[PDB]
Amino acid sequence: MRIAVLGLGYIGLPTAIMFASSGYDVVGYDIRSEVIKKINSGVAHIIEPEIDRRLKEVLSLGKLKVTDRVEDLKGSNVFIICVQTPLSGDDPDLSYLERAIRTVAEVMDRGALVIIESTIPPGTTEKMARLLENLTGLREGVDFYVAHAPERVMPGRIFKELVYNSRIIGGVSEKAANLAEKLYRSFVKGRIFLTNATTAEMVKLMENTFRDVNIALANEFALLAHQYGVNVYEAIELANTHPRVKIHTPGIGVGGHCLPKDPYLLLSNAKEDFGLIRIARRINERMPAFAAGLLFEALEKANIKPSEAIIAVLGLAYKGGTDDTRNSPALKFVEIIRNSVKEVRTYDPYVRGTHDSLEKVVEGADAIVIATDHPEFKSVNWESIGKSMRHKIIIDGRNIIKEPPVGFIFRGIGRGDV
Amino acid sequence: MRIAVLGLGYIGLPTAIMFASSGYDVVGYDIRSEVIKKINSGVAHIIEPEIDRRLKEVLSLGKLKVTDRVEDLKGSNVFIICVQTPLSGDDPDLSYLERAIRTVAEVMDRGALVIIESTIPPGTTEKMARLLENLTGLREGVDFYVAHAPERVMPGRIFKELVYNSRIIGGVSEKAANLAEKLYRSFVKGRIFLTNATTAEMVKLMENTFRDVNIALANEFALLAHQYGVNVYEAIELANTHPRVKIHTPGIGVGGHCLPKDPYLLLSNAKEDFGLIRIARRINERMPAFAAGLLFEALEKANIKPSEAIIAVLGLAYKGGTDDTRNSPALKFVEIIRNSVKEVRTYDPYVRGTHDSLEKVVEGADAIVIATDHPEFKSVNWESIGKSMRHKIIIDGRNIIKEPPVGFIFRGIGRGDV
Ligand SMILES: CC(=O)N[C@@H]1[C@@H](OP(=O)(O)OP(=O)(O)OC[C@H]2O[C@@H](n3ccc(=O)[nH]c3=O)[C@H](O)[C@@H]2O)O[C@H](C(=O)O)[C@@H](O)[C@@H]1O
Ligand SMILES: CC(=O)N[C@@H]1[C@@H](OP(=O)(O)OP(=O)(O)OC[C@H]2O[C@@H](n3ccc(=O)[nH]c3=O)[C@H](O)[C@@H]2O)O[C@H](C(=O)O)[C@@H](O)[C@@H]1O
């Protein structure tokens, strides 16, 4: 059986590779000719454990082929769309999805199964099914089938979770869901639950909104910790030993391709809400500013003129271990303080900043701001680092610092114990 | 050792019993003379699995004694306060706690260990330690010791969780925490984590606020489900199969002795916050009204004038399986519709309502409102019982109804699928 995967992003490529390694002849498609060239060389354009090893495997097996030509998709039995669905202002941007749907309409044949993996507002799958019908003259549930199979994989653990995570499949028609289930069973060992399209769409958004809201609650606990003389990270670890509690982690912010917008996708077409999801978003969105407040409070303590201060921001990626800066709170932080200080330096072991090394970025700096929890920052000799700084100041926004370095002015989000 | 337990509520009495059966001589104290009389013969003034069998055991072996005489507390090596800490308007009511503390001051000796189990705002344990010092002339950490040992037990499984639950102990002094740990290790098999008083106080409140806020999030998902044509309960069950997701349960309301007030205790002395905890409380507090909205909507659909409608409320307790109505949303619901309806009937298998049976309460009724998820309601033959009603209307506020009954006008919180 032939499967076509449209959108070879950090979830689409792994998806194509996994199916190609599970018995299917797969054709990966992406409008970006640059991405196709790189993937053909056996090396992925994205960083994800095992992706290069697995990519070469399927390329050698002859089970996976990638292209940027729509024509190569003709003859596919299944079409899986994995394109991005970011916001367009305050509205969901479904242009990438519609483009992919129209491409499928061009080559689709009777009996085809179309699966939308992209995260979308409730009602989107059915609308796209109606679009396919209008462009082909065919009928969903009779001539072709459409289903929504949202992902749950965590970047950095994608191949493992693709197999072990339980997942949901919502069919526009029952047969669509049944056909899709058989497909994923080729590698999924977790449970597969079938429902309708709208329920699957809402469930996916609910998963991510639950996460975003819980991070917001954690950040409010961080604010409260300052006033009660508590180390919020310690309090959370302690609280989480309760059989029914699993408080998330507070910090400088929430980045990535999902949490910053999925809650908005969930509210997008709602004519009525309570506002809890909205305030949680505002809370997470304001943490870079929270960190800025700690920085200026520290600079004042050290009697340092802001207009002459040199700030070293450690980390640019939206989370530790990646080179991705999508919606990174570190970037927002830089944007906030750039016009309030004399110089803002940046360093990231995975992303090119103003300086290419930690030692260099802190040399002569007045303060350090830990914006990303990269592994490199967990074994730093702050004692040695401090000796090269003009002022020993550290503002931790990622729970990197545990016991504060000696002789350093230290501030941390939720660190009311210092 | 001789341990004195002040406050024999559903946490205090079991605590006293556990210590009495763990190699300690215990004296349970409570101002309520009626409660004491019941205890020493009439076993447990409260209902909890195993409490009667366990109680008789410790009373018979002479390891546990209960009294309402302060004098009997003299000679105790440890004092454990388990009194209530409800709200008084918008303020935490610590009068019961202060009373217990002053009682302890009258009978304690040098070397005494004082443990506050009661849920309290951060900083309270320290303040009570200071009060004890001013009343006795002794110094904490030298002449006596104070620690906070918050509870995590769930009514209905108290003796089980008392033993296996990991718990937190925060001492005003390090020595107090160590002493308290050796004390609780007598029956606690779960992990015991030691920290300072304020951290322990905040952790306890964070646990319950996490639960409350997550219930409010679920309630917002319920509102959204109405608009997206989704059964929120099915969506939650599906979403919770995600490795990092555990959305709580929405419904008619949040009652009990804890969740309705603990978030307020957490914010009580905070000069600044973000608002998520506060607005979440408000959301849960308006769910009885949300249910009322569904009822009136259903009556309108049935062309029934509310002023002439007979409503049958099923459930009075704050949660299924108990007779406790503390802060019950069922009571709030009745109060809300009382003057808008001709007659409000109530039935609960554990607490006597206006009618003694489901059969009698629905006879000639215009609508049924399920306010508590009692076991009895889970097997009801709704179609059969509906034959005696004036109108077949059901408003479900506890997901007791799965598949809507045939011929009924059905509405349910978060039931957008009907
Ligand atoms: C409910 C859930 O766990 N969703 C996951 C989420 O993956 P995502 O790529 O957004 O990464 P993440 O680990 O949530 O991190 C996103 C952002 O949030 C931050 N973050 C994360 C957890 C936390 O407790 N605190 C916190 O501040 C991270 O630092 C990062 O800036 O979104 C994925 C997606 O929707 O592709 C989804 O498959 C994943 O399962
Ligand atoms: C974090 C946590 O699990 N806290 C527990 C809580 O026990 P509590 O006695 O308040 O009962 P509960 O099961 O939370 O129910 C309280 C109220 O909330 C409602 N409730 C509960 C869970 C849910 O998902 N949705 C919901 O609406 C119940 O119906 C009830 O009206 O408070 C206890 C306490 O503080 O004594 C504590 O020890 C328990 O561990």
Side-chain angles (χ1 to χ4, degrees):
Chain A
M1 187 184 291
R2 290 182 53 190
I3 296 177
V5 181
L6 295 78
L8 298 180
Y10 72 80
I11 281 186
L13 181 51
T15 291
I17 293 173
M18 181 58 78
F19 272 113
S21 70
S22 301
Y24 298 100
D25 289 299
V26 184
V27 173
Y29 168 79
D30 195 290
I31 194 173
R32 300 170 301 179
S33 182
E34 47 179 292
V35 177
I36 298 301
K37 180 184 181 303
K38 220 302 187 301
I39 299 177
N40 264 162
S41 65
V43 174
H45 58 300
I46 47 178
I47 65 177
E48 177 63 42
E50 312 189 330
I51 198 171
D52 290 330
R53 183 202 79 197
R54 291 170 179 273
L55 173 60
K56 184 172 172 60
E57 274 171 34
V58 298
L59 287 178
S60 289
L61 286 177
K63 278 283 166 289
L64 174 66
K65 65 186 297 295
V66 295
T67 178
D68 71 323
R69 278 194 169 184
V70 180
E71 184 180 63
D72 293 321
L73 298 185
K74 184 67 175 181
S76 298
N77 296 292
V78 183
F79 295 90
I80 309 181
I81 300 176
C82 302
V83 303
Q84 68 172 310
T85 50
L87 285 174
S88 173
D90 279 62
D91 307 305
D93 185 343
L94 301 180
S95 64
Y96 301 99
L97 177 58
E98 187 178 306
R99 178 186 297 175
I101 282 294
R102 288 176 183 285
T103 289
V104 171
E106 293 182 59
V107 298
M108 190 185 96
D109 282 300
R110 294 164 168 294
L113 168 62
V114 179
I115 301 171
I116 298 176
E117 174 290 323
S118 310
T119 303
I120 51 193
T124 303
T125 301
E126 296 172 62
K127 292 181 182 177
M128 293 301 89
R130 292 292 86 73
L131 177 57
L132 286 171
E133 299 185 326
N134 293 309
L135 297 171
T136 66
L138 302 182
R139 299 188 299 164
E140 195 291 322
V142 178
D143 299 303
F144 70 100
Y145 310 93
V146 179
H148 174 49
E151 258 312 327
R152 287 176 160 181
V153 299
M154 163 67 77
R157 296 169 47 70
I158 299 179
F159 290 109
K160 181 176 284 289
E161 298 208 339
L162 273 176
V163 169
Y164 294 105
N165 282 351
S166 284
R167 59 168 65 230
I168 316 301
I169 297 179
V172 169
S173 62
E174 281 179 50
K175 186 171 178 182
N178 298 317
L179 286 174
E181 175 193 62
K182 310 302 177 298
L183 195 70
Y184 286 87
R185 194 70 65 182
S186 62
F187 65 83
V188 177
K189 293 183 179 180
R191 301 171 176 177
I192 295 180
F193 297 96
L194 311 186
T195 181
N196 51 46
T198 312
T199 299
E201 296 169 313
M202 196 185 168
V203 164
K204 168 60 184 185
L205 298 172
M206 282 165 58
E207 289 159 13
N208 284 1
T209 299
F210 163 88
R211 192 172 179 71
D212 191 55
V213 167
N214 272 281
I215 291 163
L217 176 61
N219 280 317
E220 184 160 22
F221 290 151
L223 171 54
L224 294 172
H226 276 103
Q227 305 167 69
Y228 300 140
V230 175
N231 175 345
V232 85
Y233 302 106
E234 183 198 346
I236 291 175
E237 280 188 52
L238 291 171
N240 287 3
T241 62
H242 181 117
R244 295 169 283 281
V245 179
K246 191 179 178 300
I247 292 160
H248 291 40
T249 306
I252 194 168
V254 175
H257 304 248
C258 317
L259 270 36
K261 58 91 179 179
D262 286 339
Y264 290 122
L265 266 55
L266 181 59
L267 297 170
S268 69
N269 299 311
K271 289 181 175 57
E272 177 170 50
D273 74 334
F274 289 144
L276 180 156
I277 295 167
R278 289 179 186 285
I279 197 163
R281 273 277 80 226
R282 292 312 193 212
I283 287 173
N284 293 335
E285 287 159 14
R286 71 177 291 180
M287 201 84 354
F290 188 83
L294 297 176
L295 172 60
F296 292 114
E297 188 290 313
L299 292 177
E300 190 169 2
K301 188 64 178 299
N303 293 172
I304 299 175
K305 293 182 179 181
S307 62
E308 290 178 48
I310 296 175
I311 306 68
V313 175
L314 304 189
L316 290 171
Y318 74 82
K319 76 178 297 183
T322 186
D323 67 319
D324 201 326
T325 63
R326 187 58 59 90
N327 296 142
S328 177
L331 296 179
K332 176 66 175 180
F333 178 76
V334 172
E335 175 179 296
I336 296 177
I337 71 165
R338 64 180 67 185
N339 283 167
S340 292
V341 295
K342 185 174 181 178
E343 186 189 334
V344 179
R345 303 176 177 179
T346 59
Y347 166 75
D348 191 297
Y350 305 100
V351 190
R352 184 187 63 178
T354 60
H355 294 62
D356 51 45
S357 74
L358 175 67
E359 294 57 56
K360 293 175 185 178
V361 76
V362 308
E363 189 172 61
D366 296 304
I368 285 174
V369 179
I370 303 178
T372 309
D373 60 316
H374 288 305
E376 186 196 311
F377 309 145
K378 292 181 172 56
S379 61
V380 174
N381 184 305
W382 307 100
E383 296 64 57
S384 174
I385 299 300
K387 299 184 178 180
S388 59
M389 296 180 74
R390 183 160 62 182
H391 290 85
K392 308 175 184 179
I393 300 178
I394 293 174
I395 180 286
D396 183 14
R398 291 291 192 170
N399 182 42
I400 288 296
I401 300 298
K402 304 305 179 176
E403 295 185 57
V406 186
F408 272 81
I409 283 179
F410 174 74
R411 296 286 187 287
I413 292 178
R415 292 300 297 270
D417 57 308
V418 302
Chain B
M1 283 202 259
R2 191 167 187 284
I3 301 176
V5 176
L6 294 85
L8 305 180
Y10 68 75
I11 285 184
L13 183 53
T15 298
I17 293 172
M18 218 47 227
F19 275 122
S21 60
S22 296
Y24 284 111
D25 282 301
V26 187
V27 182
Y29 168 77
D30 193 297
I31 174 180
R32 298 169 298 176
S33 181
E34 301 180 2
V35 173
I36 299 301
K37 299 181 179 181
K38 300 181 178 181
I39 300 177
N40 50 52
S41 300
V43 304
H45 53 111
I46 53 177
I47 294 169
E48 175 69 39
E50 292 172 42
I51 199 171
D52 294 314
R53 177 177 175 179
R54 289 175 178 288
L55 182 63
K56 287 181 176 297
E57 177 195 4
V58 296
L59 279 53
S60 295
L61 295 180
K63 290 299 172 296
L64 179 65
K65 296 177 180 297
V66 291
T67 172
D68 61 356
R69 299 180 178 179
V70 178
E71 181 60 65
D72 301 312
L73 302 182
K74 287 188 182 180
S76 301
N77 304 74
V78 180
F79 297 90
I80 307 181
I81 298 174
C82 303
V83 298
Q84 65 171 310
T85 47
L87 285 176
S88 178
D90 301 320
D91 309 302
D93 190 340
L94 306 179
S95 66
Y96 299 104
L97 178 56
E98 191 170 307
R99 185 184 312 176
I101 285 292
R102 290 172 181 284
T103 289
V104 170
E106 303 189 69
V107 305
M108 81 186 298
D109 302 304
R110 289 171 169 295
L113 172 57
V114 182
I115 303 296
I116 299 181
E117 172 287 320
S118 306
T119 296
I120 51 190
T124 302
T125 302
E126 293 296 302
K127 289 182 176 61
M128 293 302 90
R130 295 290 86 73
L131 177 56
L132 284 173
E133 298 187 325
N134 290 319
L135 289 174
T136 64
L138 304 181
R139 305 82 178 183
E140 194 289 326
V142 184
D143 303 303
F144 74 100
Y145 312 96
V146 182
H148 176 48
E151 192 49 71
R152 289 175 157 178
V153 300
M154 169 67 68
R157 57 199 307 167
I158 296 182
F159 288 104
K160 185 190 303 174
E161 301 208 328
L162 277 173
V163 177
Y164 296 97
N165 270 0
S166 285
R167 64 174 59 225
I168 315 295
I169 294 180
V172 173
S173 63
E174 188 174 65
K175 186 171 180 177
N178 295 316
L179 286 172
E181 180 176 55
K182 298 186 175 307
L183 178 65
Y184 282 82
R185 184 56 68 189
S186 62
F187 70 73
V188 179
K189 293 187 176 181
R191 295 165 175 172
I192 295 180
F193 299 98
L194 303 184
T195 182
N196 54 37
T198 308
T199 300
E201 293 167 321
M202 189 179 177
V203 166
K204 170 58 187 180
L205 297 172
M206 283 164 60
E207 292 166 8
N208 284 358
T209 299
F210 164 85
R211 194 169 177 74
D212 195 56
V213 175
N214 270 283
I215 292 170
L217 171 58
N219 283 144
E220 181 157 36
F221 287 155
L223 169 60
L224 293 172
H226 278 287
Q227 308 169 70
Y228 296 135
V230 173
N231 173 345
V232 79
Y233 303 102
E234 164 182 45
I236 292 177
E237 284 301 296
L238 291 168
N240 289 359
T241 57
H242 184 300
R244 296 166 282 278
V245 176
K246 292 295 167 296
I247 296 158
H248 289 37
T249 309
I252 194 164
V254 176
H257 306 65
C258 319
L259 295 63
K261 58 89 178 181
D262 286 342
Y264 289 118
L265 273 61
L266 178 60
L267 300 169
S268 66
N269 298 307
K271 289 180 178 60
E272 189 170 306
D273 70 345
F274 286 147
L276 179 54
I277 294 164
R278 291 182 187 292
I279 68 91
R281 266 279 82 222
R282 281 271 62 188
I283 285 165
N284 294 336
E285 285 166 4
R286 79 181 70 127
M287 295 309 95
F290 190 92
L294 298 174
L295 170 64
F296 298 129
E297 184 174 60
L299 295 179
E300 173 62 1
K301 174 63 182 301
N303 293 171
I304 300 176
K305 185 174 183 177
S307 60
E308 311 180 307
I310 298 178
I311 313 301
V313 176
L314 301 183
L316 289 175
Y318 72 75
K319 70 182 296 179
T322 181
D323 66 307
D324 202 330
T325 65
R326 181 76 58 175
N327 297 140
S328 176
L331 290 177
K332 178 63 178 181
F333 179 73
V334 174
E335 176 195 303
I336 290 179
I337 67 172
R338 182 181 295 297
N339 66 304
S340 300
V341 175
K342 181 175 180 296
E343 191 189 325
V344 182
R345 299 177 183 175
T346 61
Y347 167 70
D348 187 301
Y350 299 104
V351 57
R352 176 51 63 66
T354 62
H355 293 61
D356 63 296
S357 73
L358 175 45
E359 175 181 298
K360 295 180 184 176
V361 75
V362 303
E363 184 178 301
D366 296 300
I368 287 169
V369 178
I370 303 174
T372 308
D373 55 324
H374 287 311
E376 187 190 330
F377 310 145
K378 299 179 180 182
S379 66
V380 169
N381 187 328
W382 303 104
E383 288 85 351
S384 184
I385 282 64
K387 294 184 296 181
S388 65
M389 300 179 70
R390 185 156 67 181
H391 287 77
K392 288 170 168 290
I393 301 181
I394 292 176
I395 178 287
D396 186 13
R398 296 284 197 167
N399 192 39
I400 276 295
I401 300 298
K402 303 305 178 182
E403 301 275 62
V406 182
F408 273 80
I409 286 175
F410 173 67
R411 293 291 184 289
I413 292 176
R415 293 301 298 269
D417 57 306
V418 304

